[model samples]
Structure formats: C-alpha cells, structure tokens
Target: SDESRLTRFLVLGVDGGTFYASAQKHTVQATDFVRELVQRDAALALRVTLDVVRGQRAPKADPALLVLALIAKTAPNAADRKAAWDALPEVARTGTMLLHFLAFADALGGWGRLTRRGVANVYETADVDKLALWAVKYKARDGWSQADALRKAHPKTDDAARNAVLKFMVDGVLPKVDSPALRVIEGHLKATEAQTDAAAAALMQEYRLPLEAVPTHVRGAEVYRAAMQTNGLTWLLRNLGNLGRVGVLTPNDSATVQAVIERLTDPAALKRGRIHPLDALKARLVYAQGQGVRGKGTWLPVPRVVDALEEAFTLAFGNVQPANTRHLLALDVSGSMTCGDVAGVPGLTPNMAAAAMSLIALRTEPDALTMGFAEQFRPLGITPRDTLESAMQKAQSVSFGGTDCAQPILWAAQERLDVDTFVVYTDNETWAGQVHPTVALDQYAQKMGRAPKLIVVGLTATEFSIADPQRRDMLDVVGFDAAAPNVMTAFARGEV
Candidate 1:
C-alpha cells in the first residue's frame, strides 16, 4: 500500500502543491512517509526511485530527488546510504536536478563523506559537454549553483577536459577544452558582457545559447530572433507572448509561426524535453488568450500556433500502452473540484484536471464510458474525438453539488454498464447514499459475476482516499498524475 503511495508521490509531486491542506502539511506528511519508508526498507525506496525515473513515470524530477535525499540522510544503515549514493547518477541527470537534491539534502541534514561521494559520483560520471551546458544554462536554481555543488563534492577527477569544465564552473576562467559544451559555455560568458544587445545576439546565435545564458537586458528584434532558434521548445512555448511583444511573431510571419509549430509538434522533442501535458495545455490556454498571466503584457496569439499547442498537448502524452479494457470515467464536479487549482496552474481546477485525464484515457482505451457525477450523474457527451479543452468544459458544464463518488459505481451497475474498470476522479471524503464504496462495488460485482476494478483517482493531496488497500480489485491513484494511465492499465490487466 505504501508502495502505491510512494509511487504517487514520485509522479505527482506536491511541489506544484495542493489544496488538500497547507503545502507545508503535505510536505511534513510526505517527508514522514518517505522517511519511514527509507527507515523500513531503504532498498525498496532506492528501487522505486530508480524504476520511476528509468521508466519516466514522473513528469517532475524533484520528488524522486527528494526521496533520494531522504534516503541518503535517513537510511537505517551505511549500506543503504551507499546504495542511495550509487543511484545518484541515474536519478540526478542534470545540474539542476543535482542542485535540487543538494538543496534537499541540505535541508534534511549536512553532507558527509557518503553525501560528498554521491555528489562526486554525479559530477565525475557526467558527460563534460552536458555538464558544461548545465554550468551555463542553470548557473543557479533555488539558490544552489554548480560552483556551490562543486565546492561541496570535490569530485576528484583525472580527465583533463572534465577538470577544465569543473574549473570554469568554480572559477570565472573560461575553459580551453576543445568541446561543443565548452564552446557553448565560453560563448555564454562572452555574451554576458558583449557591450551591446546586438553584439550579444550575435554570440547567442553563433553558439545556440539559451536565453538564460545571457543578461536579462539582452532584448531586441535580433536577440529574440536568435532566441527563437536557440531556446528550448518548452521555453519557446512559454515565451510566445514575449516573442509577439518583441514583434517576432506577427500575422504575416509565416516562417516564425511554422517554426513555432514545428517545435510544438515534434513528438521526439516533446518526449526528450519531458514536457508535461498540463504544461502544454496551460501554455495553450494562456497563449490562446494572447496575454500575460498577471496582466504584465499582451500579444495577439496566432490562431495556427494556438491550434498547434492543442496538438502538442495531446502529443505530449507520448505513448500510453492502452489496456483496451472496458472502463467508466466518473468525474467529480462538486464545489471543491472547481475552487482549487491543479498543480499551480492559475486557471486549472480539479474538475478540469479530471476532465483532461478522462480525455487521455478515452483516447487510450478503445471501449470506455465517461460521465460527470456529483449529487447526480450525467454522460458528459465527451468522446475520444473531443479536445481536452472541450472535455473540461463539459465536465464543468454542471456543477455545485455535494460529494457523490459512489454514485458512479451504483449508476453504472444500474445501467448494467458491464465495465472492467470504474475510474472515479474526485476530491471527496464520501459518496451520496449511505452505502459504502466497497458495498457499492461488491453489490455491482455480485450482479455482474466478476468484480470490477475501482480506481479512486484523488484530485487533491488530501489525507483521505476511497480505495481499500485490502481489496485487490481497487486502487487509489493520483489524478492528473502523468503516470496515472500507466498504473491504471497495469492494475486493470493484472500486471501490477
């Protein structure tokens, strides 16, 4: 049961935070869970982190890194800490990740030899080019820097090129190492003080540097032009308004629009960038509005780019191995669902998130039924053909009711829905009717001859969940979790 909970934490990190409680409450609760898990079975904690990361089961990397940091600090013995250290390279793949872990570790406790050795392993084993790129791009995040990490780890190395990169990160001296990353890093330093914005733009274009590599003052038509080609795709998505503000994205600029579309729709790039579905959809929702989030600025969104963003949202899911099992998706549209944000997205709510997730499942499962239920139930009229935005609209079309999570199973059984899975997405404490969820499921099972799987998809990080751990047929999953579909399929197919 804790395994499932741990998996949930790894995938749907509380960093986006939640409304179930104060974020600090979730942190303490989650930290205790991970700590106890580490103290109980540090090896399992290690395996789960490794498996979750290796399988790309998480959209965000911080939670896994946090678990590793906890493991390193809280493991019952030295051997477990050693195992945690050994897994560092696999889990902390980038400088930002490693720095995050270091920050977490700092919060948990101090770094000793084992911690030093682990951080050293990541540094010693990292590719010089990627490390160089990291040194430039993510110089500091959340107050941790490459130089600070280097100061702590002291990863004793023999490779001259690697040493050179490390030296540059620690000192201001540019590296003489003949490598692509070195060239990029050097160009980044050069661009930082290139005197003129136009001069800085030339260096940025020459080296394909990210916007972070240079000063914030570097802005102009030419600078934005280079940024259009050099910035990462996800960055491009977020800065489309900035581009429009700078006059790079205009109605007549078909070339720029197509370029943005190509980056948005590139499946390979989406996967490689690990762009989250919500992030993509959020970008679309914001960009489609053609304005800044907090009224900072405005832009007329290109219709084609907005459309491509929607496509990118769908494509960002990568490939879900569909179970093709019969299913009923029950969305919770009660008041709680509408009042809270989903993973810090300003306009996203729990109801909308449930709808977004239901759409994903509808597309993945060949035979699936979707409905919205609160005090009552209604077929959402959402089909595999519906867009995420439309599905969300349908889910929220009728709202304002008390919690009725059990209504889905009862309603489905009354209609003889004959479903192998009943996926209820909610932020609920109970259902409508005095009948328990287990009672409702059992009754439905007796009538149907085979027990239907019940997936309680928690829309918030609340302490209460509907699924009974003792029952093999039911599971509690985090709604809007990137890996929710993956876990649901495994459970329905008896693969978990």
Candidate 2:
C-alpha cells in the first residue's frame, strides 16, 4: 500500500513530488520510498529527488536532506553514491538553498560523511557568513560546529555579518544589528520576546529605531508611522494592519496606500522580477478581506482599500493578451480538488486555484465562456472586472460532486456552442464519465463539422492524460506557472 501510494503521488502530484506527498499523508515514510526507488533505478530516483528539492516544496522537511540520507544509507554501491553526490551541487546551487542544506544537515545526519566526501565543499566563500548567521539564528541542531567550520574555512569580510554571528554565538540571541541583512532577524527576535504592548514599546525605544526603521515588534501608532514612511511594498503590505488596528489610517494615508498599490501593480516592476505580483495580490486581498490580523475588533478594510487591491490584481494578470480565439474555459470543482492547500497560501484549495485560472482566461480572452464541471455542469458567471475574491466566491457557489471529465466536451457538443478551443483545468483524475474526454472531443468534432483544439492544463502530475496522444490539436500544459498563459496562447495559435 505504501508503494502504491508513492506510485500514485509520483504520477499525480506536482511540486511536492512523491517524497513530500508521503510526508504529508503519512501513508509512506520518505525513507521507505527513497530505499525502494534507489534499488530499482538509482539514477532516475536521484534525478527526481533533485528536481523535487530544487522546486522547493514542503519547506518544513528538506527533501535534499532525505536524498542525502538515501545515498549514504541505502545506495548499493560506490557508483550510486557518487551519482547521488554529483546531483547534490545542483540542488544546493544558490546561496539560499546552500544555507538550507547546511542548516538541515545535523537533523538529517549526513553532514560529516558528506563533508568528508567533498560534497559540502561545493559552496564559495561568499556564502559562509550567511550560512553562519542562519545557523546561529535558528539554533539549528549541531549548527555551532558547522558554523565554526564554515567560519574557519572562509572568514567573512563584512563586519556586520561577522559581528551578528559572534553576538548570536555568545549570547544565544540575535542582537540589535544595524545591517539590512540582520534587521529582520533582530525585529523577529524582539517581537517574540515582547509579549505585551509595553514590552514592545520598550524594545523599540531601547533600539533607538527611527519612525522609518520601526521594528516589526513595535505596534499600534508607531508601526503605522513606520509603515507609512517605509518604501518597501512587502513590509508595508505585511504591517498595514498595525495602522488599521490603531484606527490611525486617515484620509492623508490614502495617497500613501495608492502609491504602494501603483508600485505593486506596475507591469514594469513585474518585468524586473523584483516581486511576484500574483502572490502580492493574494496577500493584499486576504488582508483586505479581514483574514490576516486577529483581534476582538479587528480592522475591516474600507471600500477604497478593497477597490485599490482589485485594480492591482487586474493589472498584475493583464499581460497575457487574447489570442483572438473563441474559447470555453472549464474548471473541475470535484471533492478532491478541494482537499489540499493550493500553492503556499494556507486554506487555498485546488478548487480555488481552478477559479483563479479561469478568471485569468476570462479576463484575457474576450470571447471565453467559463464553466465548472464535477458530476454535472454549471455556468460560472465571472467577468473580467471581478476581483479575485469575488470570482472565487462565485466559483465556489457551484455544488461539488464526483468528477466527470467528459462533461465539458459532451455538454459543448450537445449545446452546439461554437468554440474554437476547449481549455480544461483539472487534476487529471478522470474516471466517472461514460465517455472518455478524447472520445467526447471526437464526437464533438463529428457533429460540429470542425475540430476544436483541446488544451488540458494539468493542475496535478497524473501520468494519465485525457488528451489523445496521436492528436496534433491536443495540448497538455502544466498549471500554476507564470508562463502558462503565454504557452496556452502559443499552442492555440499552432505556434507550439
């Protein structure tokens, strides 16, 4: 049963892959899956492990560490071990990823061997201080020794980083560091210690943080003033509630809020890749919808704030222009789609993801008709002007039931809706319909006298796809990627 679950997860889930899925469901231990897969095909298993780890799924349990354990404990030969070692560098290529590996090494129990074997020497000197600081700050298991090793191996030139690491090692606390690199950690530490409003104020005063440099520990009006002065969009978004909590966000702050929204929604800013607009949009909407800050009488978002966020979302996702094709966008609202979290947003289900994707299509494509399919079909009357929250609400209003993957194509054929393309967003778990999706497409073609292109967006990684393998008009694309809409447009135009 463990093996079967692993197989299903490998073929069905995205990002988390099989190992992370195993941990989530507790159906099969990751060690068992690693052992089993290594025995069968070490190279393929190693490759998949690296891919999963590189994708950065399930942040709590490092998959890279698991792969290392598999190689050290279960690999059958020297060649297999070498192969695993060869893949390690790619998984921990970046500074952040390298830090994650070093911090997790003691808990996973392979650092010494990995180091002796030269796997830990892959990082450069520039990463040493960062690695040291992270280890000390998190109080990682056996981190002191590793940090000491890194420090001796490559001494840091930056005094602030060196000082922060020294302070942390000596006092077991992140001191009030002035560098941007250590500021957040200092603020985080203070916030954790300050359990009351008075304590928070005292800490802020002791640190001598200006109104512009108000630590996250400082709450109420201090936080409000600091957030207003700070140009950092992310910081402001995360702390907008402090202002709201104290009822200090006045009409004058409206300009400040609007400026933040403009910067967040600017297409050029998105082009620079400084931030993920969709993620920012989600945060803004969630906060505005009264979900982020908690209190007896929490701050409710005003009409102005809500309107600004809606406009930002429209700008954020407006880059993908229509391909000038008549399209029918179908979203699966089955029970399974509502099971797990969508992306990293807690409580965001796959059903909500389906609606979000549908809204993107509806907003971009002028002639798109949106529908929800489970055991039955329902028209989701979402428009381009609707906010993300509004669209999700409308999409969730449909009655959820068993999955019917063929319902979209069959219903289209029966209704004779002249569509140029059929875009289906689903988990690829199609089992309940009388007709296969491909078969329904063929029937639709025969009746309509023209074959419409079928674009099946795989929201999950199911090996079985409804797209006919032999059909040139059928395209299968992965979902939740930034480039998905562009890929869909290219495919619809026969350019892909």
Estimate, for each residue in 330-365, the C-alpha lDDT of model 1 and write its tens digit.
Answer: 776656677765554556677777877787777777
lDDT of 1 at 160: 86
Candidate 1's TM-score: 0.79
lDDT per model, in order?
A: 0.74, 0.56
| lDDT of residue 25 for candidate 1 | 33
TM-score on alpha carbons, each prediction: 0.79, 0.58
Tens-place lDDT digits, model 2, residues 162-258: 5565445435565554555455446545555654555555554554333433334446665455435543555555554555666665445776556
| lDDT leader | 1
Candidate 2's displacement at residue 303, Å, is: 2.4
What lDDT score goes with residue 180 in model 2? 50
Which candidate should be chosen as best, given TM-score against the real structure? 1
Q: Please identify model 1 stretches exceeding 4 Å from their true place.
A: 1-9, 12-37, 74-76, 107-112, 141-144, 231-233, 261-280, 308-323, 332-358, 374-378, 385-403, 425-432, 445-496
